[PDB]
Structures are given as structure tokens and as C-alpha cells.
Amino acid sequence: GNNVVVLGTQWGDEGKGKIVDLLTERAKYVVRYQGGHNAGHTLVINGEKTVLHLIPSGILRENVTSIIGNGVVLSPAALMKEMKELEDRGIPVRERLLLSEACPLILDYHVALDNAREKARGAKAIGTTGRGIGPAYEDKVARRGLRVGDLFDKETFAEKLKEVMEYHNFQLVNYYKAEAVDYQKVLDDTMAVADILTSMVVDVSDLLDQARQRGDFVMFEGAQGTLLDIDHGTYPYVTSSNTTAGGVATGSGLGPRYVDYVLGILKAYSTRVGAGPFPTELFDETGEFLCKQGNEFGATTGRRRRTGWLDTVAVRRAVQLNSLSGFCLTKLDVLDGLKEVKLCVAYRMPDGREVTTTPLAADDWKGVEPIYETMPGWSESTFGVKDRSGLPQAALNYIKRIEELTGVPIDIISTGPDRTETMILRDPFDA
Amino acid sequence: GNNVVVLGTQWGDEGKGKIVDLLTERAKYVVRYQGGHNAGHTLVINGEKTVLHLIPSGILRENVTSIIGNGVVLSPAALMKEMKELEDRGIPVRERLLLSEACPLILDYHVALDNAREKARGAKAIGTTGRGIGPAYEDKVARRGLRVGDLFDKETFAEKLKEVMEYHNFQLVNYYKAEAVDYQKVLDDTMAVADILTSMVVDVSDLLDQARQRGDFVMFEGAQGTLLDIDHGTYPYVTSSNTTAGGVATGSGLGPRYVDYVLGILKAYSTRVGAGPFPTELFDETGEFLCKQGNEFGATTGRRRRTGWLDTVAVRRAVQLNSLSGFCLTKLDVLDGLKEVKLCVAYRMPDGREVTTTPLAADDWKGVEPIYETMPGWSESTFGVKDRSGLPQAALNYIKRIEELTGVPIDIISTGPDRTETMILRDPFDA
Numbered sequence: 001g002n003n004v005v006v007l008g009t010q011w012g013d014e015g016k017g018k019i020v021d022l023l024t025e026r027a028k029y030v031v032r033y034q035g036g037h038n039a040g041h042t043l044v045i046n047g048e049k050t051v052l053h054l055i056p057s058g059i060l061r062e063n064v065t066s067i068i069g070n071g072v073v074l075s076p077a078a079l080m081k082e083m084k085e086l087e088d089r090g091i092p093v094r095e096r097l098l099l100s101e102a103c104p105l106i107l108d109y110h111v112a113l114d115n116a117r118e119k120a121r122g123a124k125a126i127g128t129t130g131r132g133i134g135p136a137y138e139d140k141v142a143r144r145g146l147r148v149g150d151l152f153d154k155e156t157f158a159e160k161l162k163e164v165m166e167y168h169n170f171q172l173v174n175y176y177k178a179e180a181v182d183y184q185k186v187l188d189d190t191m192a193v194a195d196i197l198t199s200m201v202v203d204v205s206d207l208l209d210q211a212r213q214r215g216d217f218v219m220f221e222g223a224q225g226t227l228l229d230i231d232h233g234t235y236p237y238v239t240s241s242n243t244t245a246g247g248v249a250t251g252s253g254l255g256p257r258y259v260d261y262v263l264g265i266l267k268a269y270s271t272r273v274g275a276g277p278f279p280t281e282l283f284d285e286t287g288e289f290l291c292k293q294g295n296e297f298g299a300t301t302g303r304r305r306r307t308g309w310l311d312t313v314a315v316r317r318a319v320q321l322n323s324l325s326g327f328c329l330t331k332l333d334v335l336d337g338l339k340e341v342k343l344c345v346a347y348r349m350p351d352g353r354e355v356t357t358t359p360l361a362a363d364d365w366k367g368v369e370p371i372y373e374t375m376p377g378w379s380e381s382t383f384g385v386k387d388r389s390g391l392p393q394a395a396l397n398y399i400k401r402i403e404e405l406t407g408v409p410i411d412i413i414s415t416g417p418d419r420t421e422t423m424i425l426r427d428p429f430d431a
Numbered sequence: 432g433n434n435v436v437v438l439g440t441q442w443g444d445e446g447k448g449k450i451v452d453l454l455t456e457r458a459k460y461v462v463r464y465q466g467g468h469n470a471g472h473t474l475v476i477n478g479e480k481t482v483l484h485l486i487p488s489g490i491l492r493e494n495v496t497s498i499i500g501n502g503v504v505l506s507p508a509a510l511m512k513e514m515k516e517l518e519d520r521g522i523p524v525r526e527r528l529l530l531s532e533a534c535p536l537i538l539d540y541h542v543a544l545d546n547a548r549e550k551a552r553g554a555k556a557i558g559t560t561g562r563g564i565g566p567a568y569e570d571k572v573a574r575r576g577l578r579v580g581d582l583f584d585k586e587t588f589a590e591k592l593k594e595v596m597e598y599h600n601f602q603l604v605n606y607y608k609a610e611a612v613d614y615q616k617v618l619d620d621t622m623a624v625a626d627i628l629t630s631m632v633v634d635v636s637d638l639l640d641q642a643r644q645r646g647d648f649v650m651f652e653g654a655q656g657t658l659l660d661i662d663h664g665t666y667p668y669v670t671s672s673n674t675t676a677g678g679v680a681t682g683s684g685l686g687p688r689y690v691d692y693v694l695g696i697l698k699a700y701s702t703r704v705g706a707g708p709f710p711t712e713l714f715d716e717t718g719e720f721l722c723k724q725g726n727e728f729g730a731t732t733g734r735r736r737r738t739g740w741l742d743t744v745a746v747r748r749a750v751q752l753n754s755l756s757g758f759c760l761t762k763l764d765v766l767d768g769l770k771e772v773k774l775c776v777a778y779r780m781p782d783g784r785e786v787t788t789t790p791l792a793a794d795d796w797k798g799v800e801p802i803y804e805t806m807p808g809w810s811e812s813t814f815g816v817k818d819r820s821g822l823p824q825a826a827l828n829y830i831k832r833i834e835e836l837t838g839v840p841i842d843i844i845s846t847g848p849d850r851t852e853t854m855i856l857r858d859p860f861d862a
């Protein structure tokens with residue numbers, strides 16, 4: 001179909017950035033619909049690396065108009081920092097990026113709050129990226145938050161900013177005993193980039209509606225992953241937005257009935273950065289192997305990622321929540337050399353029951369044990385293979401099993417960080 | 432289709448409760464996906480009235496399983512209050528109601544906070560229903576909020592409740608100078624109903640997925656209305672949840688691609704309860720007429736509702752945001768006796784431009800003027816008419832014009848508060 005959603009079926013870092021950059025060759029628009037700069041999407045073109053955070057992954061293509069939708073919490077600072085970094089590399093961001101006036105603004109005090117809250121949790125810290133994401137979504141739903149639209153009146157903005165900061169600082173100092181955030185500083189930093197930021201404003205809801213009516217190709221790019229979903233993830237160890245497919249509509253304004261295909265980015269194994277339940281987590285040599293071979297370190301915080309086997313129980317939950325149309329199996333090449341590979345096919349509950357369904361809130365995942373199916377690995381190299389024909393049978397079997405267990409086909413297979421180290425068996429845009 | 436969404440295309444109170452109760456005769460499930468008890472849905476069967484708030488509008492049908500989805504903020508108090516009221520009237524709520532463990536809990540301190548925040552806004556008060564809705568969504572996205580799932584461990588719950596209340600009370604007394612909320616009282620009130628509440632818990636995401644695979648008829652019932660949407664409504668004069676169609680997926684767990692038909696409940700004229708922009712608002716005799724004839728008073732707060740002409744510009748925004756399949760025109764009977772009727776077809780911006788599109792944030796609606804198309808009214812009574820044949824031509828013309836202006840057909844016409852005072856031209860379930 002014309003409207004394709006690319007999102008993470010696990011705990012993020014599945015390879016959304018690459019696949020979005022890969023598939024947008026035919027797209028007219030690329031749209032981020034939730035999250036903020038907590039995301040870290042890595043693109044590699046002819047060996048050249050690019051890490052995006054707030055800026056959509058279609059920014060490297062000039063035929064594409066990248067769009068930061070209303071569902072996104074936007075940090076003017078982060079935007080300018082990335083804009084300048086990309087512009088110095090020949091990417092004219094301002095010319096291909098548009099954003100929603102309904103976007104909530106992330107400012108310094110949000111970060112201070114983020115840090116304070118994480119501190120107060122002590123050993124039970126969520127392990128946020130400390131980018132102020134949570135607090136920004138909080139001011140939004142509370143209805144005191146600032147939005148891009150507020151910037152259109154420099155005067156009234158300063159007033160609104162002043163009272164909201166008086167509100168937060170009171171808490172930062174009196175309740176948390178932390179430094180206060182300077183009103184004037186935040187006002188100046190923001191005012192220094194107001195004209196640039198506002199010149200990219202557009203009515204995204206309307207734009208996407210017109211694009212749909214014209215049959216334009218639109219790609220929605222998700223951030224984080226399904227199990228980090230504020231509603232359906234391992235609460236409270238989740239992000240504060242809806243990472244699941246439903247967030248596409250709320251975060252862009254496109255009517256939900258206009259989603260044609262949902263592509264789940266599925267990593268051949270599992271990773272998680274931040275605290276929280278991880279049934280198939282490995283602490284042995286294999287885990288260490290995955291981390292090393294997969295270069296698993298947060299593209300945003302650089303923190304070492306927790307590793308584990310692919311979890312079919314957890315992935316099946318992602319199938320139903322996102323009404324997945326197909327998967328894109330990534331980093332299959334990272335498993336090369338393993339004597340055997342395992343995939344969780346069931347959970348052994350603390351009371352002894354065997355289930356094929358996942359617990360909701362984090363607490364409920366306690367004591368849950370993974371039940372594995374063990375398959376033969378392969379010594380052959382699959383790195384960069386662009387044809388299923390060039391893959392070992394053990395790998396094909398592993399692929400087929402995943403499909404059988406999930407009931408969803410694997411339409412794309414990635415064998416390397418580069419845009420071309422991939423094999424598209426079925427393109428979402430014409431499927 | 433099998434999955435039909437019924438939601439408000441305006442500012443709420445369009446008549447969602449009636450139409451849901453009307454159409455669920457063929458439904459297996461009815462699902463609320465956002466909001467809380469701030470909603471007020473009025474059902475009238477053979478003259479008998481029922482006002483629901485938290486409880487879905489399919490509760491009066493025994494063949495229907497009502498479901499409070501995860502997107503809903505749930506007040507244990509409100510639930511029990513409604514449960515007992517309905518049970519004393521022969522409606523065995525506990526036997527036909529199921530709810531999500533992922534639902535955030537609304538407790539007394541949320542109400543206190545709600546009241547405090549509204550006080551702090553002074554003359555710029557949002558005009559919330561003071562039910563604690565906003566604060567509950569705030570604790571949720573912040574990830575400190577309590578959920579139905581937490582109730583499964585009475586011990587750990589008290590601990591979690593204790594620390595979150597210490598957090599909020601600090602603010603209530605030190606920052607707002609308001610009374611504190613008693614921890615023990617909240618703990619006892621909640622514990623007094625824990626067993627009842629938890630006995631209705633079910634995995635809603637999974638349930639709806641199985642129901643979809645079986646082809647069961649599912650009706651999603653929205654609360655509030657499109658322009659009250661936290662993202663797309665007249666911010667900050669909106670509710671704190673996504674009232675638009677996209678909220679169906681995030682608030683229930685059903686994959687977005689599984690929405691078959693979206694039915695927009697459209698009142699023949701406009702009403703708004705709470706502060707905020709209202710372009711076609713009438714302060715004359717006609718406005719007073721609408722209020723009186725339409726018995727316009729919040730079914731939840733009893734507050735007099737602001738009235739005005741039907742706004743096609745604002746409604747068109749609802750068309751695209753919700754990817755509407757059709758409308759259900761309600762309270763056509765309330766216009767009987769008017770010499771002429773008007774419908775806004777364009778906006779005159781403050782700078783002089785004529786536009787057919789709506790402003791986003793409230794501030795941006797300032798100075799906006801409505802441009803009307805005036806049509807002849809009708810003296811004939813349309814109350815209770817169950818056949819389009821029994822409607823005056825002027826009414827048919829008014830109906831056709833609405834369709835022409837919006838590009839969406841009016842599949843149902845309501846002519847009275849009773850379930851039967853209606854005419855279904857096309858049923859969403861088989862259309």
C-alpha cells in the first residue's frame with residue numbers, strides 16, 4: 001500500500017533507521033509520530049555513518065520530505081544540534097524538513113526533572129535516556145506544556161514559559177533539593193532559534209490527508225519498540241509514548257483506516273537498554289558474543305545493551321498489538337558462527353503453567369521462565385548477502401521457523417548495517 | 432465491517448451513548464478506549480433514562496460484553512457507585528463487564544490535584560469536570576501512576592500508594608496550600624473494593640484479537656469529542672486523552688488495521704461545555720432556543736452547555752482526523768420551528784483570508800469569524816420520525832447540504848432521545 005509503517009517489534013534498536021532509509025527511495029514523505037531525541041537511528045551508506053535522533057530517517061534523500069509529527073516531543077536544542085551537524089555534511093535539513101505546530105516542546109527543565117525523577121527512584125530507576133522525554137509528555141497531558149505553536153507570539157510565549165518554570169523550579173529546589181533552571185537562559189536559547197524552527201511549520205494532518213488522496217507513498221517511522229509502549233509495554237519500564245502502531249494516527253493526524261501495511265523490524269536476537277523484564281536475557285558467553293558481534297551499544301547513550309535470544313512469545317504480542325503485515329529480520333549476520341541458536345516459544349509461569357502469552361506490567365513478569373526450541377546454527381558467513389540463495393539452510397530454517405511460530409512472513413532480511421546489505425523479498429509499497 | 436467505532440465529531444455530547452446502545456443489538460463486545468467518568472452518556476429505553484459515565488453503553492444488553500480498555504483512566508469509586516446504581520435496577524454489571532489490568536487508577540488525590548490546577552488557572556480555567564482525569568493521565572505518562580494490575584498484590588500496592596501520595600501531598604500543601612489527602616483513607620476505600628474490581632480483569636488486547644479472528648462484531652465507544660483531543664483539539668482547552676479514532680488502537684490493544692468503519696456522531700447544531708474557542712457560538716435568542724429545546728446541560732456536571740450552529744469547517748477536520756466512514760446526525764428534531772438554519776462553511780481569518788481549514792491551538796482561533804450559508808428551516812415536527820419519508824424537504828436539503836459540504840454520507844438520523852426514535856439508512860456492521 002501507499003502508507004507503510006515501520007516500527008520496532010521488541011525493545012527498540014531493531015534497525016528502524018536503516019530500513020526506513022532503505023525503503024524511502026520510493027517515498028514522498030517520511031513521518032516520525034512519537035518519542036523525541038531519545039531515539040538513535042543509525043544509517044550507513046557506502047560505509048558512511050549517520051546517527052539521527054529527532055530528525056526522521058528519510059532526511060538523506062532529497063526526493064523525500066521528512067516530517068516531525070505532532071506525536072513527537074521536540075527539543076529545539078536537539079533539533080538545531082542535529083540540523084547543523086547534518087548541514088555541514090551537505091544535507092540541507094531546513095529544505096526537506098517540516099514539523100507540526102502541535103508538537104510539545106522539550107526544554108532544559110524537562111531534562112532536570114527527568115534526572116531528578118530517575119534519582120528519586122534509586123535502584124529502581126527506569127534507566128531513561130535523560131533527554132526529558134517523560135516530563136514533556138507529562139506537561140502535555142496536563143495541558144500546561146508549551147508547543148511549537150506557542151512560539152508564534154514571542155511575547156505571550158515568554159509569559160507562558162515564565163509561569164511554567166516557576167511551577168517546575170518550585171519542585172526542583174523545594175522537593176528535590178536540586179539546582180533551579182534559569183528562566184532567562186531558557187528563554188534566550190529558545191528565542192535564538194525561533195525563526196528557523198517556525199519556518200518549517202506545516203499543517204501535518206492536512207498535508208497527509210492531501211497526500212493520501214493523491215496516492216502518495218508515505219512512510220511512518222517509529223521510535224523505541226513495542227514492549228516500551230507506555231500502555232502495553234512492561235510498565236513502568238517503558239517510554240512515555242505509544243510505540244505501537246496505534247500511535248501513528250494519534251501522532252500524525254492521519255486517519256487510522258489509512259494504514260495499509262505495518263512492517264515490524266525484528267532483530268534476529270534480543271537487546272534491551274534500560275531496566276526491566278527480559279525473559280530470554282543471556283548473561284553467559286553467548287550473551288557477551290551477541291553484544292560484541294552485534295556492536296550492541298545505545299546509539300543515543302552508548303550504554304551497553306542487554307542481550308538475549310529472540311523471544312517469540314513477546315514478538316507474538318507485537319504481532320497482534322500492531323496488526324503486523326510482515327517482518328524485516330535484521331542482523332541475521334550477527335549469529336554467524338554459533339553452534340546452535342534458540343528461540344523462546346513459551347513461558348513457564350511462577351505457578352507452573354505453560355503459556356504462549358505475555359504478562360503486562362513489569363511486576364507480573366517476575367519469576368517468568370523462557371521455554372526454548374533449539375536449532376542448529378551455521379558457520380557460513382551471511383554478512384552482506386543480498387540473495388536468500390546465498391544463505392545457509394540452517395538460516396533458512398531459522399527464518400521459516402520464526403514465520404511458523406508468529407504466523408507472519410519475513411518480507412525483508414538485513415545482513416549488514418549498510419543500506420545495500422539487504423534482501424527485499426516483498427516491498428511493502430507494492431504489497 | 433465487524434469493528435465499528437462510534438465517536439464524537441465535535442466537542443462531545445453529540446449522542447454517543449444512545450447510538451452505541453442502539454447499534455450494539457448486533458454486537459458481541461462494546462469497548463471504551465479513552466477518558467474516564469468525565470463522560471456522560473444518556474440512554475433512553477421506552478422512556479426510561481440511564482446515564483453512564485465509566486461503564487460502557489452496551490451494559491444494558493445482556494448479549495453484550497462491555498469492556499473498559501487500557502486507554503481508560505479508571506476510578507474504583509466511580510465504578511462501584513455506578514455498579515451499585517445499575518445493579519439495583521436489575522443490571523448485573525459484574526456479569527457483563529470486563530476491564531484491563533493496564534488501566535491507570537483514578538484516586539482521590541487526582542481530584543484534589545485537578546481542583547488545585549483549575550484554581551491556579553483562575554479566569555483561564557480549562558473548565559474540567561473535576562473528576563481527576565488530567566492528573567491520572569499525568570501520573571501514567573510519568574510512569575509513577577498506579578494501574579489495576581498493581582491491585583493484585585495488596586501489600587506492594589500500599590507501599591506504592593504511600594510513596595506516590597507523599598509525592599503529591601507535598602505539592603498540594605506546600606505549593607498549592609490546600610488540604611492533604613489521607614493515605615489511609617484512600618487505601619481503605621480502595622481495598623474495600625479490590626476483590627470485586629479485580630474479578631473483572633481480562634487480557635483485553637488478546638480478547639479483541641481472538642474476537643477479530645472469529646469475526647465477532649465489536650463496537651468501540653468514544654468519550655468526549657474530536658476538538659477536545661489532547662493532540663489535535665483546541666489546546667489547552669481539551670481533555671487529556673486522544674478522542675480521535677487513533678485512540679481506539681492505543682486504548683484497547685486492537686491493531687489499527689482492524690478498524691472497519693468509523694461512525695461520527697454529528698449533532699445537528701453545536702454545543703460546548705468548558706472554556707475554549709467556539710466560532711459559531713450563539714449568544715442570542717437562537718442560542719437560548721437551542722439550549723432549551725435541546726435540553727443542553729452536561730450529563731455529568733449539569734452545567735449549561737454553550738450552543739451554536741453546526742460548524743462544517745470544524746467538522747471537516749474531524750472527517751480527516753478520524754477517517755470517517757459516515758455520520759449519524761443527531762437531534763435534528765431540536766431545530767423544528769426555526770425560521771431558518773445556518774451552517775458555517777468557511778472561516779474569515781483575522782488577517783482577512785477566507786479559509787476552509789481549522790486553526791490548531793486555542794490561541795490561534797482568536798479573532799476567527801464564521802462564514803455562514805443560510806437555509807430555510809421547517810415548522811413541521813420531526814420528533815420520533817423513523818422514516819426519511821416523514822421528514823420535511825427543508826430538512827432533507829439541510830441533510831444533503833451537510834453531506835455535500837463534508838463529502839461524507841449521513842447513514843443514521845436520530846430524531847429523539849429514545850433508542851427507537853431513529854432511522855438507520857445504512858448499518859455500519861454490514862456496510
Ligand SMILES: Nc1nc2c(ncn2[C@@H]2O[C@H](COP(=O)(O)OP(=O)(O)O)[C@@H](O)[C@H]2O)c(=O)[nH]1
Nearest residue numbers: 013014015016017041042299331414415416417
Ligand atoms: N550487522 C548488522 N548490523 C546492522 C544491521 N542493520 C542495522 N545494523 C546496525 O545495528 C545497529 C542498530 O541500532 P539502532 O540504529 O539504534 O537501531 P534503531 O534504533 O532501530 O534505528 C546500528 O548500529 C546499525 O548500523 C544488520 O542487518 N546487520
Ligand SMILES: Nc1nc2c(ncn2[C@@H]2O[C@H](COP(=O)(O)OP(=O)(O)O)[C@@H](O)[C@H]2O)c(=O)[nH]1
Nearest residue numbers: 444445446447448472473730762845846847848
Ligand atoms: N431531542 C433529542 N435528544 C437526543 C437525541 N439523541 C440523544 N438525545 C439526548 O441528547 C443528550 C445528549 O447528551 P449526552 O448523553 O451527554 O451525549 P453523549 O455524551 O455523546 O453520549 C441526552 O440527554 C440524550 O438523551 C436526539 O436525536 N434527539
Ligand SMILES: O=P(O)(O)OC[C@H]1O[C@@H](n2cnc3c(OP(=O)(O)O)ncnc32)C[C@@H]1O
Nearest residue numbers: 012013038039040127128129223224239274
Ligand atoms: O528516555 P525514555 O524516557 O524514553 O526512556 C525509557 C526507556 O526507553 C528506553 N529507550 C528509549 N528510547 C529507546 C530507543 O529508541 P530507538 O533508538 O528509537 O529504538 N531504543 C531502545 N531503548 C530506548 C530506555 C528506557 O528504559
Ligand SMILES: O=P(O)(O)OC[C@H]1O[C@@H](n2cnc3c(OP(=O)(O)O)ncnc32)C[C@@H]1O
Nearest residue numbers: 443444469470471558559560654655670705
Ligand atoms: O474533565 P476533563 O479534564 O476531561 O475536562 C476537559 C474538557 O473536556 C470537557 N469535557 C469532558 N468530558 C466531556 C464530555 O464527555 P462525553 O459525555 O463523553 O461527550 N462531553 C463534553 N465535554 C466534555 C470539559 C472540559 O472543557
Ligand SMILES: O=CN(O)CC(=O)O
Nearest residue numbers: 040298299300301302
Ligand atoms: O539508540 C537508542 N537507544 O539504544 C537508546 C540509548 O542509547 O539509550
Ligand SMILES: O=CN(O)CC(=O)O
Nearest residue numbers: 471729730731732733
Ligand atoms: O456529558 C458530559 N458532559 O457534558 C460533560 C459535563 O457534564 O461537564
Ligand SMILES: [Mg+2]
Nearest residue numbers: 013040041299
Ligand atoms: Mg536506536
Ligand SMILES: [Mg+2]
Nearest residue numbers: 444471472730
Ligand atoms: Mg455526555
